[PDB]
Amino acid sequence: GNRRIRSVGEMAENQFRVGLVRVERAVKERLSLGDLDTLMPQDMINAKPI
Amino acid sequence: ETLRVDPTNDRLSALVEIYRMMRPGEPPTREAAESLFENLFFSEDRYDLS
C-alpha cells in the first residue's frame, strides 16, 4: 500500500520532460536575446536534446 | 525544546540560516533567500506532488 508501479508510459514521459526542460532552458535565453522578428519556431528549438 | 535550541530570531534570520546551511560559499540576500526558499517547496519548477 506504499509502493507503486511505474511503467514505460511514465518513465518515457519523465525522460521526455527532462529533454523538454533542457530545451526550454536553452530557448528561453534564445528568445530573451533574439530579435523575435526574423525568428521562426523551428529556429527556437533543436531536436538534439530531446 | 526546539525553541531552546533555535539560534535564529525571525524571518530574516530564518532565511539567512537556511541560505547559509543550504549553500556554503554563497552570501545570503533578502531578494535571493526567497528565490531559494520558494524554489525549495513552493515553486512548480522544483516541487510537484503527482
Binding site: 535565453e29 530573451s32 536575446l33 | 560559499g25 554563497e26 552570501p27 540576500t29 531578494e31 535571493a32
Partner: protein, 153 residues
C-alpha cells in the same frame, strides 16, 4: 568610481559571456552600475577571464552570476569579490593599446597534404619569406618547397 572585477567564463564562450553581460545590464537597466567589459585579444591575453568595470552591490553581485556561462568573480572571499589594482588596470590597458629556420633543423609542416610530416631543412628560401624542406616521398625523397607558414618549431 567603477573598479574592475575579474570573472570566470567558459573558455571558448568568452565573447558570448561579454555579450550576455552587455544585454543583461541594459535589460535590468543597471547601466549606471557597469562601465565597460574587457576581453583583450591579440592577432588572447587572458584565456578565460573577463574583466568587467563595475561597482559592488548585492544586486550587481547576483546580476553578473545571472549572466550565462559565468560562475562568478575571482577574489579573496565569495561575499566580497575584490578588484584587481590601480596599476593592474593601467598595465592591461597599456598592453591592449601597444624564429629563423636554421639549416639542418628537423621540422614538421603546418598545413597542406604534407601537413605534420617529419621533414628536415635542406636549403634557405629566406628573402622570399618561403622555405624548402626535404621529405621522404616515393624513395626519391624529393626537394620540396613550402611556405613560411608551414614551419613547426
Amino acid at each position: 568610481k567603477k573598479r574592475w572585477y575579474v570573472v570566470q567564463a567558459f573558455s571558448g564562450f568568452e565573447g558570448r559571456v561579454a555579450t550576455s553581460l552587455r544585454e543583461h545590464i541594459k535589460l535590468h537597466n543597471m547601466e549606471d552600475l557597469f562601465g565597460e567589459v574587457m576581453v583583450p585579444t591579440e592577432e588572447k591575453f587572458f584565456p578565460g577571464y573577463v574583466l568587467v568595470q563595475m561597482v559592488m552591490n548585492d544586486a550587481s553581485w547576483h546580476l553578473v552570476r545571472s549572466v550565462p556561462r559565468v560562475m562568478g568573480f575571482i577574489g579573496g572571499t565569495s561575499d566580497r569579490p575584490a578588484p584587481i589594482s590601480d596599476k593592474e588596470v593601467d598595465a592591461i590597458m597599456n598592453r591592449l593599446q601597444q624564429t629563423l629556420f636554421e639549416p639542418g633543423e628537423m621540422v614538421r609542416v603546418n598545413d597542406g597534404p604534407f601537413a605534420d610530416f617529419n621533414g628536415v631543412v635542406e636549403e634557405v628560401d629566406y628573402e622570399k619569406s618561403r622555405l624548402k624542406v626535404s621529405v621522404s616521398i616515393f624513395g626519391r625523397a624529393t626537394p620540396v618547397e613550402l611556405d613560411f607558414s608551414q614551419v613547426e618549431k
